[PDB]
Write a protein that binds this ligand. Sequence first.
Ligand SMILES: CCCCNS(=O)(=O)c1ccccc1
Ligand SMILES: CCCCNS(=O)(=O)c1ccccc1
Ligand SMILES: CCCCNS(=O)(=O)c1ccccc1
Lengths: 119, 119
Amino acid sequence: APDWVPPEVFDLVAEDKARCMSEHGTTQAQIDDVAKGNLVNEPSITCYMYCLLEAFSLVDDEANVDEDIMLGLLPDQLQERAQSVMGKCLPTSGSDNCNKIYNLAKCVQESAPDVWFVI
Amino acid sequence: APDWVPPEVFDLVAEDKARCMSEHGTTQAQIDDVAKGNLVNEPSITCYMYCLLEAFSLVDDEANVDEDIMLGLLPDQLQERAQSVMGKCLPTSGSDNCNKIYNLAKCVQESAPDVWFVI
Ligand SMILES: CCCCNS(=O)(=O)c1ccccc1
Ligand SMILES: CCCCNS(=O)(=O)c1ccccc1
Ligand SMILES: CCCCNS(=O)(=O)c1ccccc1
């Protein structure tokens, strides 16, 4: 949703978006809420984000973020900002994979809400 | 094991853990191996998982799973996530009891790696 997201990402994620929303019972409404900063800790959205990340190998089976793959997918414009916020927010911590991603999202959104995006 | 697993279960299983590891020649390394995502189809671990399940009355003599009790014993957030996964992955199928549980474990891990834990 933020204006920096490369156009190609909308097509790149389309397959795994459909699959992940089906698996987690996610609605588009929940997703639209996130750029508005209305994220709540509900598995239907938190496990969706986990699902989408895992699909691009941005996280492992334990929801640990691969910083290199994350920076790789991000555009050049955001490398500086994203590296700083990852330093701050990683490694992930939480009770389960979905909570780990919720905790990461909240962490990022505290200083850099426009760096965390969901589609 | 994942961070969500109830503290109580470490003590609750200690008796049957010992008996089940002894029965199936299981080593602690094999058990630890699973958390890492490295579950293999080997009877010393797959029959161990059967054995622990049966101890909690979660499987019968044919490795049919009691979905209701399995789900009921999971903490709230894991119970929600597992309902879907268990809908897909149950009832069990396979050539023997040990393979049935291997197939269940892999099935669960495809969508919900952190849901299927072994101790
Ligand atoms: C780092 C930005 C947060 C990623 N959130 S997301 O899980 O919806 C997602 C969006 C796009 C690709 C993969 C995952
Ligand atoms: C007695 C209370 C502990 C059971 N909780 S459990 O999540 O570890 C669990 C173990 C085995 C199957 C399902 C859930
Ligand atoms: C979601 C259920 C996981 C079952 N895994 S287990 O069979 O090794 C087991 C762990 C603890 C108690 C009984 C069985």
